[PDB]
Design a protein around this ligand. Structure first.
Ligand SMILES: Nc1ncnc2c1nc(Br)n2[C@@H]1O[C@H](CO)[C@@H](O)[C@H]1O
Ligand SMILES: [Mg+2]
Length: 390
């Protein structure tokens, strides 16, 4: 009569990391990739023999900086002359060129110089997320919901759909990232009456706050605010500067000019930063860091919290601006939702909870997975084709 339908998937197409989920048997499964990772880097690398996507691209970035592309989401649907694009290009090791006032990334690939539109790079990341899902389900996937930031305009939304089409996906809908995080908690299923929800999204490179109103499952974006220069990478930079100074004091050597030693220090700092979210102290053990000197040290959570103290406190400024813009008071917020891996930091949680006078934070769904979780919930609703009974 009627063949069983393939499951639809939910994709969080992130600036630095992407995540895929599927809703089946009344629950969401966040799908790990073939290296066992629940999130996949939004990186594409180009060589003379291969195109690598995800963890394989990110793991070879150190020696291939010119031909490894990341941050395509900062370029998608924008003009080459846009001041945002011009500033961002100074920080990128890959070439960004001007093709009719549209940015393109130019790399060496399979013996030739090749330029790609940002949507083409994003389609390569979406192809990887589709293959991650098909490896778990064991059949081809066609339908997907893709999320975008709430501030994305029409051009940015259309370029995201185009990336989906190039990847061979049928895009069911483009949904806002804060709306997807709210859906993950079922905040649109609480029935009649208005609810005000604040989504606190602290990423690798940016911070976004959104205030939504939910009335009978209908979402309205009331206010957005943030900081483009505040994320997990700034906390990593504070630890790097701390340990460079520490090596200087202990061994009377400045390591800051050996890229490999700085990179090995930064990699270790980011992992120590993660350990400090669960432990009160973390060890740093690097062999032959500089001039055959082993660097074995530690950092307490109290010292890390002091190093980043100004940065953590500055997350409350966009919260107050969003509340003024929404014309609401903090007591009028019904639910607080955490998004992004950097929200696992205990001090960040404490500051926000203290600001909202001890209120509980929704953090039960892994913050790096909440957006994809909500996108997978929506994807399963959008493919329903039930015919009413008499
Ligand atoms: N448990 C964690 N505690 C502290 N930080 C974390 C954690 N997990 C993740 Br993931 N991060 C950081 O989140 C950002 C995601 O782009 C990166 O800067 C990661 O370092
Ligand atoms: Mg995100």
């Amino acid at each position: 009569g009627s063949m069983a339908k393939a499951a639809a998937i939910g994709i969080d197409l992130g600036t630095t990391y992407s995540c895929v989920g599927v809703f089946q048997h009344g629950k969401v499964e966040i799908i790990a990739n073939d290296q066992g990772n629940r999130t996949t880097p939004s990186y594409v690398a180009f060589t003379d023999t291969e195109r690598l996507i995800g963890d394989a691209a990110k793991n070879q970035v150190a020696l291939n900086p010119q031909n490894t592309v990341f941050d395509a989401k900062r370029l998608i649907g924008r003009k080459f002359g846009d001041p945002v694009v011009q500033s961002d290009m100074k920080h990128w090791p890959f070439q960004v060129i001007n093709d009719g006032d549209k940015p393109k990334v130019q790399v060496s690939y399979k013996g030739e110089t090749k330029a790609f539109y940002p949507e083409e790079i994003s389609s390569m990341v979406l192809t990887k997320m589709k293959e991650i899902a098909e490896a778990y389900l064991g059949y081809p996937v066609t339908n997907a919901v893709i999320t975008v930031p709430a501030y994305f305009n029409d051009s940015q939304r259309q370029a995201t759909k185009d990336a989906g089409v190039i990847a061979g996906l049928n895009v069911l809908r483009i949904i806002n990232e804060p709306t997807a995080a709210a859906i993950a908690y079922g905040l649109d299923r609480t029935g009649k009456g208005e609810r005000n929800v604040l989504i606190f999204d602290l990423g690798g490179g940016t911070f976004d706050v959104s205030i939504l109103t939910i009335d009978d499952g209908i979402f309205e974006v009331k206010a957005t605010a943030g900081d483009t220069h505040l994320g997990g990478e700034d906390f990593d930079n504070r630890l790097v500067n701390h340990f460079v100074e520490e090596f200087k004091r202990k061994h009377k050597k400045d390591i800051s000019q050996n890229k490999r030693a700085v990179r090995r220090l930064r990699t270790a700092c980011e992992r120590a930063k993660r350990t400090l979210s669960s432990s009160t102290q973390a060890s740093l053990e690097i062999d032959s860091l500089f001039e055959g000197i082993d660097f074995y040290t530690s950092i307490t959570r109290a010292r890390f919290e002091e190093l980043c103290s100004d940065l953590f406190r500055s997350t409350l400024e966009p919260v107050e601006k969003a509340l003024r813009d929404a014309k609401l008071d903090k007591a009028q917020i019904h639910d607080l939702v955490l998004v992004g891996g950097s929200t696992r930091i205990p001090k960040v949680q404490k500051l926000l909870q203290d600001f909202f006078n001890g209120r509980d934070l929704n953090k039960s769904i892994n913050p790096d997975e909440a957006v994809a979780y909500g996108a997978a919930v929506q994807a399963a609703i959008l493919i329903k084709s039930t015919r009413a009974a008499a």
